[PDB]
């Protein structure tokens, strides 16, 4: 009783998809019609979707598609786009936390009589999120953090970690990170110590999984969460570690985790910071040592220390897209039960809750 239309992503280098060929096949089995746009960015090719029974359509064709098709994507639509949104949309819209230009995003849905079901806010009957990317954010963050630390062992300070492509599968990711790590150890480098803030969550678990798989001793991983951070910063353990991975989004006017003063020290060991939570619009950033959101084509940015060894930050805001196939498979799978409830969305609590939130926020405009 439902037509879904998989929108081609346009955010630069975003390789994930909201529906995978496997989830498309499962949906067609439950009676759905599924259109899939031919996406040059997607880690999945159109042959895979055709074999799943998708009808292949051109990139950007959603914007003239019949009003009854549910348009599904992951990330935001072009900043340059300004036309009424007439469809029911399933997407991350990032317009419910007073983000810059949120009113203009909503005034497209309002003008067109469209609906937004925001992926970020889809919840079960116990208030738990139905599908989220945190594990693969941590996993990809750790992968880049280890390659950065490694690079600093094997290369001069006048070179930076090169552009990276998303890995086509986990085996590829692990092969790459492992090779760099083993080459770093072959320079005589001490095996790194890795401090994780938010170790117990999805992101933390992801980071920990990567670090084990690439052969970093677990005795070398300092696992911090609420128990430890509640003490209040700045923490000496951060500059003392080789690598620091943050999984916690915090914006309270509290003491920072570290700062430039603590980092400016010839005795600092810290080489690499991965802020998985990084958001350059954060008014009270607990890691105030960067102003840039780095990207896959330029994944690290120098921390402008005045003492100590070269320090870099990784602040990519779409880390799961470094392992787009696995990240999309797990996310789409977790989302599937709710997706299967779409025929009866006027009564299904998951979708009802989400429609009311859109209503609640449209009233705020
Ligand atoms: Cl193929």
Curated annotation (Swiss-Prot):
Biological source species: Saccharomyces cerevisiae (strain ATCC 204508 / S288c)
Protein name in the entry: Saccharopine dehydrogenase [NAD(+), L-lysine-forming]
Cell compartments where the protein resides: Peroxisome
Activity regulation note: Inhibited by p-chloromercuribenzoate and iodoacetate by modification of the active site cysteine residue. Inhibited by diethyl pyrocarbonate by modification of histidine residues. Inhibited by pyridoxal 5'-phosphate by modification of an essential lysine residue.
Residues at which L-saccharopine binds: 16, 75, 99, 129, 133, 277-279
Highest classification ranks of the organism: Eukaryota, Fungi, Dikarya, Ascomycota, Saccharomycotina
GO biological process, one term: protein import into peroxisome matrix
Any Gene Ontology CC annotation: peroxisome
Functional pH dependence: Optimum pH is 10 for the forward reaction, and 6.5-7 for the reverse reaction.
InterPro entries found in the cross-reference section: AASS, AlaDH/PNT_N, AlaDH/PNT_NAD(H)-bd, Lys1, NAD(P)-bd_dom_sf
EC numbers: 1.5.1.7
